[PDB]
Amino acid sequence: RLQRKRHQRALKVRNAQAQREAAAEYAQLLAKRLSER
Amino acid sequence: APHHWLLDKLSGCYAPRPSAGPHKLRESLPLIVFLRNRLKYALNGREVKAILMQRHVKVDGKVRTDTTYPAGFMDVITLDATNENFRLVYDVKGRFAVHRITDEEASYKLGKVKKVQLGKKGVPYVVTHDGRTIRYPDPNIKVNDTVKIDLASGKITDFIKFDAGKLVYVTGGRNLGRIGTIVHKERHDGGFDLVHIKDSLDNTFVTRLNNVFVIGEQGKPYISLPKG
Amino acid sequence: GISRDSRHKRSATGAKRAQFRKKRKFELGRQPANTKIGAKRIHSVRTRGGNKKYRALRIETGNFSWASEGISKKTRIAGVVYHPSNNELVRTNTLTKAAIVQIDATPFRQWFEAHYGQTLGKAKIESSVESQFSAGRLYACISSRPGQSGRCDGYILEGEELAFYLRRLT
Amino acid sequence: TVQSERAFQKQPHITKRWYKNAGLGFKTPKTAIEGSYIDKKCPFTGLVSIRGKILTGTVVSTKMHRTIVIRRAYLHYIPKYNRYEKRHKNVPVHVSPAFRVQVGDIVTVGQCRPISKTVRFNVVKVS
Amino acid sequence: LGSRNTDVQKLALDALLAYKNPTLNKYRDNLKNLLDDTLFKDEITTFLTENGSQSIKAEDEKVVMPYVLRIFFGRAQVPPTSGQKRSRKIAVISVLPNFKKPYINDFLSLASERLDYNYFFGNSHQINSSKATLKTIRRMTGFVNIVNSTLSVLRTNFPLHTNSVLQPLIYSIAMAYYVLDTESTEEVHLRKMASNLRQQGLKCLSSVFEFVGNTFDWSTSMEDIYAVVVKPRISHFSDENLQQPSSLLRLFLYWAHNPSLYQFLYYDEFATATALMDTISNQHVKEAVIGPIIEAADSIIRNPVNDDHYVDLVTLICTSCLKILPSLYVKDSNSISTFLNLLVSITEMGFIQDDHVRSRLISSLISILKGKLKKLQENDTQKILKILKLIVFNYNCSWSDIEELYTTISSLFKTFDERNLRVSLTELFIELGRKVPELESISKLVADLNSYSSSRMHEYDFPRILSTFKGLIEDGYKSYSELEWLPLLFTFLHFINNKEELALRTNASHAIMKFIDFINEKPNLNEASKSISMLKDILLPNIRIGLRDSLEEVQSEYVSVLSYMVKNTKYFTDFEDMAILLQLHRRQRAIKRLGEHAHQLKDNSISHYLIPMIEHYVFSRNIGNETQIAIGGLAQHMSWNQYKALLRRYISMLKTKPNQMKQAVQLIVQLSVPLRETLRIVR
RNA sequence: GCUCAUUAAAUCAGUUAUCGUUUAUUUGAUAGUCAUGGUAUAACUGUGGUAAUUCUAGAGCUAAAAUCUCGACCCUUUGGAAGAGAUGUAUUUAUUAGAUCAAUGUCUUCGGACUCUUUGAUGAAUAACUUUUCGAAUCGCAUGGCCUUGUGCUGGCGAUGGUUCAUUCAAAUUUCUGCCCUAUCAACUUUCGAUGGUAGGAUAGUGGCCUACCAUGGUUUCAACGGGUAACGGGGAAUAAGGGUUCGAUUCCGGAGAGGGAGCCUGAGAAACGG
Fold it and tell me: From the record, what ranges are coiled-coil (chain C)?
């Protein structure tokens, strides 16, 4: 419970730091490659 | 049970119907007839199931435990027998053909794009024939072009435009896969956009636009089509 | 029990009613869900498994726009005065699409004073709508189909939209 | 004039008249894109989309308002008779108020989310 | 009632119902429906709705005003974590606008009673209650958010009492500045909250200036409000507001727009003007931020102050006008229109009237003449013409600077297209000739421009133009007067654009022949080449102008001019290398007998003369077939680069123009006929 | 699943589009702005009735925020650093959009002015609401960063839960073609709209499908409409029959219904013989 509230608050920010950084990661791949065109 | 399965009439009354998946059902193929009926590799469906559960085979980089996964054009099949790697290919004589590929050409897969559309939050995407969706594509690709997929990510390594002069394999229609794969393109009444193909035996014959499969260049194409 | 099926009709030649099927679940021509004004009532209708249509049976307010500045507030309904495709629909006071219905757009006036600060002669708009802010009975159409939306939406009529419609009023 | 009914019409367009490119090698006449008729069922500056099947044929009837009848025909080869025999099947198509279409008048037609139970095609180019 | 708990709200509603009041007993259903969260929007639309059904009485709503406001503020004080709670907050903001004016003052004082502003009002500017509690910050943020909600609903109706609304907002603004002054690096959450408090307070203050305008007399507390502005913001205000038009910048811009608050900027000791000018003079400023400064100076110019230090504000604007000369070149269409209008307003005031100011204005007019007015509107071109006329109205005149200005004016007169703007430019040149000392050719060109403008005004001056053309034919205008002939070249090009029977075209050819004879008489390598280069610049563009035009009279006049110019001048080495030359049946026979059959190198002379006639024959049947044979002779008489340019012109016209594709291909095949013959000869 | 049923482009075979639609299931992408204060339903005994049902009533007890032309810039790009930057979809209507350059050029006064098929790169979002979402509900492993030394703010894989698109089997209409004797039936359709226009309702959706008000039209001697078919006959539907002349055999096949009309019901499936 308290241990489960540890893993809940850990994972809720873990996919936040994973996906939304990856959201900007291929966004900058678009930005570098649009400058190529 | 049609003839592109390349299965004998003996040993089976009800052919295994393919399940729902990333391909049209007519050129679909379950992995059970790929192993125990064309590779002659298993003997019963129960060990075909045991092949899938013990995860020594995989398709397109995913383990994909299903008896009736439909298999499309030149899918990458990964097996663990002397680290061998397999790819399908189409034959002129109305059948299927799988052959050994090494791992460098197994890393990519050259696939035709189906449609292109601007998506959510203003981003563009593109879809292929195998259901794989690639976003932020090349803006210079059009309908009936092709793309290489990474097999680790879904992005682009290589791409060529549809044109008149380069190797554009044929798939579907009254014909099914003649080697030589190019003359040119023109229009027609009713739609049904005319694509002509000239073989190595130098005969020209017309097809449709949905059968476009740009496989490479004269000399070197990107696919490892074997020797007959 | 209404039919939306295509084979009930006559052919281009006028073929004589070949009588192939009877009615199934798929061509279920639903009832005409005519509404009225009053306290808001909602019906949820399940079609095609997971599509939830919203039948608006009674409705009292709507989201009507004013295109000259592009704004829309919530306005209390008053009553329909004209419909193009029907006349007894007006006497029934049932609000379908494109029906010309009165409102008392007091918060439109309240927004106008909160954006300009000048009274309405008791940057500018044309004179034919100054005839009825004093009356407080502003005309508006219906934009969305209320029978499946479960919502009432429209816009205020604008310039020539009056000058063609009070011509059709009289 | 254009206003001839009990309701004003204007397409929502998903410049005051949004040009829409057909594809399939087509371009608007200048009368259509600077017209005044609204006509949301017309394939240009309207919600309907032109795509798919195309056909060309000769107008045979233009007697009434905003749809016309096209005679398309072929010297149809009956195999047992070894004879090309002309057969016409006059299909009715919609006509937009951008092309002053009379009988004769070779044109091109294509499918336009078919309108009323026999109108399956729509004019896109005159000649 | 002020608590955010719903059970406390229901307990207070039971306390309100227990109070002896018959109107509240009549409105007991209204209190229960407002307490019910499921009927929260329904109670506003029925019980709280005025000018409709189920409205309260006049005496009943006046007595129950504080109870209704405390319930509404308690609904507002609930946190909007949920979407329904956020929609309840928006409905609470919307329902407050239709109650009353004094009830809105009571609800604002109720929010002010929740906060604390007596200690800050008692002190001059110090935060005496030095408590940096986040709860004190959150209470100030809630009152700021409620005021922002109130300003959003009632943007021209939200009244503001000075002691109630303005004093607590200033106290919240001063607390945020005191929090930022005490902002250590440890309390990151408190520093971030005060930053949002400063951002919300500045937007609320900008909205308050936007809401009041000329309504609320804000001049009573304007001294303390600007004291809060000068301390927290004006430390590095010019060094900060440079990304876009800032909240303090828009507050200064609205203070610039309002004449009463313009005196409030004048109440400050020119600190706002010095900050605005230095932000305008920033090294890496943005165009959108600078554009607000230009509009603010235009409002200051259009509305001069009738008070103290107004000339000091005018002198600060004139010093900003000195910085505005290096500006207006690092910037859309509206920015060009605003920069032109600000320069026109500065010239209308005439504050920069010094000789060194006019020297910088001459440099500014040099950059203005450098900027071509093709993209700009004709009114902006007329405004630039009026601004230069204002500089011409100033007596600051030179010789070398006037000569560079006359060269730009002659380029402007040749490129002039508007009838009114060319009339103003000719009047500007008439003013320029009178203003610039030792400008007699400018005065002569002013007489030439006056006859040109009178010819545009009426057709009777066409005989006066012909007499002036006869006078210039009798001239006498040598290479020294080629600057006057440059205005004559612009006038001839203006006549070339028109169709006045080519009388000026033949007279300018006679004037060029007289000028070439004087240039041939003057054997100096500088002045004769300068007249030749002026002739080469004015004829070769006119040859290309005559190439595109269908005026055969212009082409025949150019043919007679080029016959005499090749015979007399013949100066260039490239012209000497190309000097291999000197109805339809006569044109075909002359083309076959020309030097194209006698030369293989003269590409430039053949292309500049015969290719326009070949294109004219391409548009006009037998002549086109004869031109194709003439093109083949010209292709054998051309160079490698010129043949590729003609082929690229032929190939691109074949793809684009569907007029004559086969004729262009036949011309390409005739061009390929000499190319294949030369390729086999090389092989 | 069972028995009775032939209407001759009718089913059916497909040449095709569904940017006009639906989709549980198949894949591929896909977000963010008090360790239950709280209701859990859950059963149980304990007497009864009724001829009688899986008939039944009543009683008690279960520091939730990162991003920026980025910047005043400094002192280096390992950079950091003032702060007008503001940053959830779902429905459901509106308002605003969704070119020129470095030129392999002619030409130049040998700088570089005349800069798309003259190197080459190609333009043509939101203000409101609704009977939103509360914006990882779970889980197996690990037993970490370091003092906030507390049963701590912690993550490496979290397999798997959701949101919206494309694909997929599922059909819905529909494009054309593929059939039999016939003109000793020449006109038929409005004699259930017959043909279009627009609007509205309904539909998952185009739709005369239906309704409203208009205009009167549409298909034909190239045969519209009409008489014949155990259409147990057709369909390459299907291997073959290693010679039973052309098939011995394989299957699709024409529908309605669960005593009979009438209406309703849930499911991505259906007017169910599982109400």
Answer: none
